[PDB]
Design a protein around this ligand. Structure first.
Ligand SMILES: OC[C@H]1O[C@@H](O[C@@H]2CO[C@@H](OCc3cccc(I)c3)[C@H](O)[C@H]2O)[C@H](O)[C@@H](O)[C@@H]1O
Ligand SMILES: *[C@@H]1O[C@H](CO)[C@@H](O)[C@H](O)[C@H]1NC(C)=O
Ligand SMILES: *[C@@H]1O[C@H](CO)[C@@H](O)[C@H](O)[C@H]1NC(C)=O
Ligand SMILES: *[C@H]1O[C@H](CO)[C@@H](O)[C@H](O)[C@@H]1O
Ligand SMILES: *[C@H]1O[C@H](CO)[C@@H](O)[C@H](O)[C@@H]1O
Ligand SMILES: *[C@H]1O[C@H](CO)[C@@H](O)[C@H](O)[C@@H]1O
Ligand SMILES: *[C@H]1O[C@H](CO)[C@@H](O)[C@H](O)[C@@H]1O
Ligand SMILES: *[C@H]1O[C@H](CO)[C@@H](O)[C@H](O)[C@@H]1O
Ligand SMILES: *[C@H]1O[C@H](CO)[C@@H](O)[C@H](O)[C@@H]1O
Ligand SMILES: *[C@H]1O[C@H](CO)[C@@H](O)[C@H](O)[C@@H]1O
Ligand SMILES: [Co+2]
Length: 363
């Protein structure tokens, strides 16, 4: 019902979900006052993506869509934004993943069951345009981390599952963007063609789904969209910002059979450049970051359908508690803000850091 032609971000308005607004209003604002408290309240109104990282989270997707349906009846012209993130043996390169499904334990079957719940929801809410980011931190590993056994052994499962998700969610009211890492990952010249080759193969293998509009980049990362000078940590890589990355891989996708692929790029934590990253590969609660460019389809660059906020600022990337199960040492590095809670949990000090270093400012 909520069909569209071309850029799915045009003709609609991204919904700022109640989940994130609850976190900010009930977990952050009570600790703030004056200017900060008022600025914080405005952050809750910026639309970001809701992550469906567990099967238990799926009911929240419907509640969100239900809120949208109600809003849309009253002049509302909103669209839902969700991240599909629950592949079996998820985050194969990490020493310890929080993923709930394991390939060796009927993981692929469970993933398909997971996708089935989501498709049923989208079909029930066909009247709502649904924008989806497909499995961050998955396909990118197949380009550079096959040297890691867990990744080598998960390749076929990753490919099978992603093919199931894209074909089953290929609906008229849906727009999917395959996670494609970021400039510092696949942007390196040597990784470009192999990456394009892979994404194009996933597209064609899924019979060129009309709903698969393109790729998503910088998800949960901090790269600049169009910074004019190379940060020290990007040395050696000519592709040091996301604009350069999509313009590099874009033509290669077409060379490999995927024409008319577009992109969306995360800027939710890219507001301050350069970041406090000591190494480009430092991904956990990086210090020296701020909210970035606001979600908008007026990108001034046709390859980019829209600036977006996929990783919600304030929600932790991982704990710095070394006694916690699945603790990752990257979250205890000198350039990671600590002490930090479990991944996904509210991290007040990081929210304040983002708000404080926001550009455009909220204050
Ligand atoms: O905040 C939304 C969503 O965030 C999840 O946490 C994210 C998981 O992916 C991480 O990026 C990939 C990665 C790199 C290295 C090791 C590992 I293990 C993963 C992001 O940094 C992180 O923010 C969180 O799990 C989930 O609950 C939450 O809904
Ligand atoms: C193509 O789809 C099948 C479906 O099972 C999957 O197993 C395979 O890995 C996919 N190939 C690629 C390159 O995505
Ligand atoms: C980068 O993009 C933002 C938003 O589109 C814009 O305001 C800014 O002028 C751009 N910077 C450059 C150097 O073009
Ligand atoms: C669904 O219908 C709308 C309005 O007619 C179109 O714009 C879209 O292309 C799809 O066919
Ligand atoms: C989404 O947001 C509002 C409508 O609710 C408008 O400003 C915009 O054009 C779009 O409809
Ligand atoms: C609103 O929802 C958020 C997200 O679950 C909670 O953190 C908050 O306590 C309130 O229930
Ligand atoms: C959470 O609630 C507060 C107060 O109602 C708002 O100011 C904020 O924008 C968010 O909706
Ligand atoms: C955040 O959550 C609290 C309950 O923990 C609510 O009272 C508040 O309105 C907001 O939803
Ligand atoms: C908000 O932040 C304050 C400290 O700034 C805490 O004391 C409070 O519990 C909440 O986390
Ligand atoms: C933040 O600022 C607003 C006015 O802009 C106040 O209404 C609020 O109480 C807080 O001081
Ligand atoms: Co229902």
């Amino acid at each position: 019902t909520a069909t569209y032609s071309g850029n799915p971000f045009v003709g609609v308005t991204p919904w700022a979900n109640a989940y994130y607004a609850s976190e900010v209003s009930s977990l952050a604002i009570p600790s703030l006052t004056g200017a900060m408290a008022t600025a914080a309240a405005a952050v809750a109104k910026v639309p970001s993506f809701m992550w469906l990282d567990t099967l238990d989270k799926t009911p929240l997707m419907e509640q969100t869509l239900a809120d949208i349906r109600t809003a849309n009846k009253n002049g509302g012209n909103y669209a839902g934004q969700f991240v599909v993130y629950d592949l079996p043996d998820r985050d194969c390169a990490a020493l310890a993943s929080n993923g709930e499904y394991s390939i060796a334990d009927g993981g692929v079957a469970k993933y398909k069951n997971y996708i089935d719940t989501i498709r049923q929801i989208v079909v029930e809410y066909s009247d709502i345009r649904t924008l989806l980011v497909i499995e961050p931190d998955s396909l990118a590993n197949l380009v550079t981390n096959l040297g890691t056994p867990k990744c080598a052994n998960a390749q076929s499962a990753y490919l099978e599952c992603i093919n199931y998700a894209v074909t089953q969610l290929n609906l008229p009211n849906v727009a999917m963007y395959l996670d494609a890492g970021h400039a510092g990952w696949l942007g390196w010249p040597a990784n470009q063609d192999p990456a394009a080759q892979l994404f194009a193969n996933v597209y064609k293998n899924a019979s060129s789904p009309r709903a698969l509009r393109g790729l998503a980049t910088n998800v949960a990362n901090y790269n600049g969209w169009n910074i004019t000078s190379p940060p020290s940590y990007t040395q050696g890589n000519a592709v040091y910002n996301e604009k350069l990355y999509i313009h590099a891989i874009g033509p290669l996708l077409a060379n490999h059979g995927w024409s008319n692929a577009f992109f969306i790029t995360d800027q939710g934590r890219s507001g301050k450049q350069p970041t406090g990253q000591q190494q480009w590969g430092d991904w956990c609660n990086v210090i020296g970051t701020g909210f970035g460019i606001r979600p908008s389809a007026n990108t001034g660059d046709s390859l980019l359908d829209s600036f977006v906020w996929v990783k919600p600022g304030g929600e932790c990337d991982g704990t710095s508690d070394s006694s916690a199960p699945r603790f990752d040492s990257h979250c205890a590095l000198p350039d990671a803000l600590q002490p930090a809670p479990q991944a996904g949990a509210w991290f007040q000090a990081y929210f304040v850091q983002l708000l404080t270093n926001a550009n455009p400012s909220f204050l």
